[PDB]
Amino acid sequence: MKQDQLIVEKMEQTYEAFSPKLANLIEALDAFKEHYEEYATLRNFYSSDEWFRLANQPWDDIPSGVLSEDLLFDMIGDHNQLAADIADLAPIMAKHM
Amino acid sequence: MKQDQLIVEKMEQTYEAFSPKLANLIEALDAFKEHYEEYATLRNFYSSDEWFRLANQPWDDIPSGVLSEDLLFDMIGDHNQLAADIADLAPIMAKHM
Ligand SMILES: [Ca+2]
Ligand SMILES: [Ca+2]
Ligand SMILES: [Cl-]
Ligand SMILES: [Cl-]
Ligand SMILES: [Cl-]
Ligand SMILES: [Cl-]
């Protein structure tokens, strides 16, 4: 039918929008999880005595980005915002099971 | 120093591994969130009277994937596994704030 076709088209367009985003999140989450064990190391290094001492050494090349005033600060911020977004999503997904 | 260099190298290698995975998850989560409002539509369509009726019509071309026995079933499974993984991650991230 002409009308059955309309229903199917709408559903296919909906699936095509949503399904790749579901897939990409699953993939990204799995990759993140294999390395999240390293986060405390980086968080704890930023603003530590050693980080500051190293940042203020007279390097003969451009210092590593980890030694900058802002790079790991921004990483911590991105982490904390992600934590909040994951916390907010969790019960919403549970509701859709 | 030779040794200060060792500390910095280790931290830089750690950051280079972790930081892109954090970024990719943030990006994937944001994209998913803009379309998660469509999930109930697709979930509810699968195994519905209309879905089954449409799947059993005599289409003159290959039926749309949404009409298959397995495609949306697998999407629901992927969703439910993701829900559980997000629920498990949420308190772990809170602990690292
Ligand atoms: Ca396509
Ligand atoms: Ca590189
Ligand atoms: Cl690991
Ligand atoms: Cl490790
Ligand atoms: Cl939307
Ligand atoms: Cl919408």
Automatic annotation (TrEMBL), chains A, B:
GO terms for molecular function: identical protein binding. InterPro entries: DUF4298 (IPR025384). This is DUF4298 domain-containing protein.
